[PDB]
Amino acid sequence: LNVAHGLAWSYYIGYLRLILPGLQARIRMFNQLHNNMLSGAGSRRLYILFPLDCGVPDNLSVVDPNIRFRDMLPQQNIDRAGIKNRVYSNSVYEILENGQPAGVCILEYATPLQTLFAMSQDAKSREDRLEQAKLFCRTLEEILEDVPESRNNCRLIVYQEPTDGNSFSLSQEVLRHIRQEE
Amino acid sequence: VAHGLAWSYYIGYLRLILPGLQARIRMFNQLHNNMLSGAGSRRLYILFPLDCGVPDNLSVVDPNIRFRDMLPQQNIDRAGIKNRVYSNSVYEILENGQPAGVCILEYATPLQTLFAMSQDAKREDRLEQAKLFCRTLEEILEDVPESRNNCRLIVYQEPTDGNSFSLSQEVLRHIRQE
């Protein structure tokens, strides 16, 4: 349709383009402080949760008994070529599998999906929201494909959280992605 | 879309940052010898250019609006819940080469979404959209009195050319007329 394009571009321009080139330096800072806790597959990329249903939690953090908050990435004052950085909120979680920590992961939501959710809650549909969300995703995927540094430092985790039933597990989904990486 | 942008910008951002702001201003002033003082120094000022010209790097880029420092973080909110981290910059406003104020300033970031939409192969509509986004946001803030206490919208139109418009004077104009 229309808004997906704008959402993808602004989310790149105003966020991903800004945070991705400084991420590894901040992972390094985090690992120096926290005895290499950010180690193992899936631990050194920004994983962006992209629920096509657009269910981003209000408070933006992952809320899930099997995805346990541990810590946030520290900040880097100055970027690689001497330009001052803004500040970024990035959270590191441990993924549980049967009560046992199975991985550590920098996880967050693709925040603009909230905008799509809001649009579908005004008196002036959900299937349109889904199509918009998909288009938002593939447009973002195309953009990242054009910058090879970015694609190295982040992965999109695209799924659909059903509105009811107990079939879907986000933690297993995140594990599924990391373990299948090649 | 304006409606959706207003609600998400509130829900996902303003609602989150405003209740913790005075505590961080306090933190900033204990560290920096009360530098954040004077009218217009203790509210979040949100630049809202209807033209939607938000700078790519999100910060204010202007010889008369000089970056000084960023607000520190507060780990835990008032009722014991862990806070996220926020980027908030403090500038000094110059008037004739003389500091005339200090101000926490930032752009209403979603306006970039409106700008991008108007750059697709598939502006007056953008302007209308921006206005609506603004008043929707204004109505929302009207319902939460704490929020309206801790932030002000600075709504203007930056012309695409000519030298008639000054952002620093505009911000001063707002603060002095409060």
UniProtKB/Swiss-Prot annotation, chain A:
Residues the entry annotates as binding 3',3'-c-di-GMP: G14, R86, V87, Y88, S89, T111
A Gene Ontology cellular-component term: Golgi membrane
Positions carrying Phosphoserine: S89
Chief localization: endoplasmic reticulum
Keyword Nucleotide-binding tagged: yes
Subcellular location: Endoplasmic reticulum membrane; Cytoplasm, Perinuclear region; Endoplasmic reticulum-Golgi intermediate compartment membrane; Golgi apparatus membrane
Binding positions for 3',3'-cGAMP per the UniProt entry: Y15, R86
Binding site for 2',3'-cGAMP: R86, T111
Crosslink position(s): Glycyl lysine isopeptide (Lys-Gly) (interchain with G-Cter in ubiquitin): K84
UniProt note on tissues of expression: Present in spleen and thymus tissue. Also present in dendritic cells (at protein level).
Cytoplasmic side: 1-182
Effect of C137S: Does not affect palmitoylation
Family: Belongs to the STING family.
Subunit structure: Homotetramer; in presence of cyclic nucleotide (c-di-GMP or cGAMP), forms tetramers and higher-order oligomers through side-by-side packing. Interacts (when phosphorylated) with IRF3; following activation and phosphorylation on the pLxIS motif by TBK1, recruits IRF3. Interacts with RIGI, MAVS and SSR2. Interacts with RNF5 and TRIM56. Interacts with TBK1; when homodimer, leading to subsequent production of IFN-beta.
Protein name as catalogued: Stimulator of interferon genes protein
Species whose genome carries this gene: Mus musculus (Mouse)
Residues of the full protein shown: 152 to 336 of 378
UniProtKB/Swiss-Prot annotation, chain B:
Effect noted on mutating C52S: Does not affect palmitoylation
Cytoplasmic side: 1-178
Localization (cell): Endoplasmic reticulum membrane; Cytoplasm, Perinuclear region; Endoplasmic reticulum-Golgi intermediate compartment membrane; Golgi apparatus membrane
Positions with a binding annotation for 2',3'-cGAMP: R84, T109
Family note: Belongs to the STING family.
Cyclic dinucleotide-binding domain (CBD): annotated segments: 1-178
Keyword terms: Autophagy, Cell membrane, Cytoplasm, Cytoplasmic vesicle, Endoplasmic reticulum, Golgi apparatus, Immunity, Innate immunity, Ion channel, Ion transport, Isopeptide bond, Lipoprotein, Lysosome, Membrane, Mitochondrion, Mitochondrion outer membrane, Nucleotide-binding, Palmitate, Phosphoprotein, Transmembrane, Transmembrane helix, Transport, Ubl conjugation
Domain notes per entry: In absence of cGAMP, the transmembrane and cytoplasmic regions interact to form an integrated, domain-swapped dimeric assembly. In absence of cyclic nucleotide (c-di-GMP or cGAMP), the protein is autoinhibited by an intramolecular interaction between the cyclic dinucleotide-binding domain (CBD) and the C-terminal tail (CTT). Following cGAMP-binding, the cyclic dinucleotide-binding domain (CBD) is closed, leading to a 180 degrees rotation of the CBD domain relative to the transmembrane domain.
Major localization listed first in the record, in broad terms: endoplasmic reticulum
Chain positions recorded as 3',3'-cGAMP binding sites: Y13, R84
Residue sites binding 3',3'-c-di-GMP per the record: G12, R84, V85, Y86, S87, T109
Whole-protein residues included: 154 to 335 of 378
Effect of N88A: Strong decrease in cGAMP-binding
Modification(s) after translation: Phosphorylation by TBK1 leads to activation and production of IFN-beta. The phosphorylated pLxIS motif constitutes an IRF3-binding motif, leading to recruitment of the transcription factor IRF3 to induce type-I interferons and other cytokines. The phosphorylated pLxIS motif facilitates SENP2 recruitment during late phase of viral infection. Phosphorylated on tyrosine residues upon MHC-II aggregation.
Alphabetized GO MF terms: 2',3'-cyclic GMP-AMP binding; cyclic-di-GMP binding; protein homodimerization activity; protein kinase binding; proton channel activity; RNA polymerase II-specific DNA-binding transcription factor binding; signaling adaptor activity; ubiquitin protein ligase binding
Gene label: Sting1
GO biological process, one term: positive regulation of type I interferon production
Effect listed in the UniProt record for changing C134S: Does not affect palmitoylation
Protein name: Stimulator of interferon genes protein
Other facts noted in the record for this chain: Was named MPYS because the protein sequence begins by Met-Pro-Tyr-Ser residues.
Lipoprotein listed as a keyword: yes
Record note on disruption phenotype: Defects in innate immunity. Death within 7 days of herpes simplex virus 1 (HSV-1) infection. In addition, mice show a remarkable reduction in cytotoxic T-cell responses after plasmid DNA vaccination. Cells fail to induce type I interferon production in response to dsDNA and infection with herpes simplex virus 1 (HSV-1) and L.monocytogenes that deliver DNA to the host cytosol.
Binding positions for 2',3'-cUAMP per the UniProt entry: Y13, R84, T109
Cross-link for Glycyl lysine isopeptide (Lys-Gly) (interchain with G-Cter in ubiquitin), residue positions: K82
Result, substituting C103S: Does not affect palmitoylation
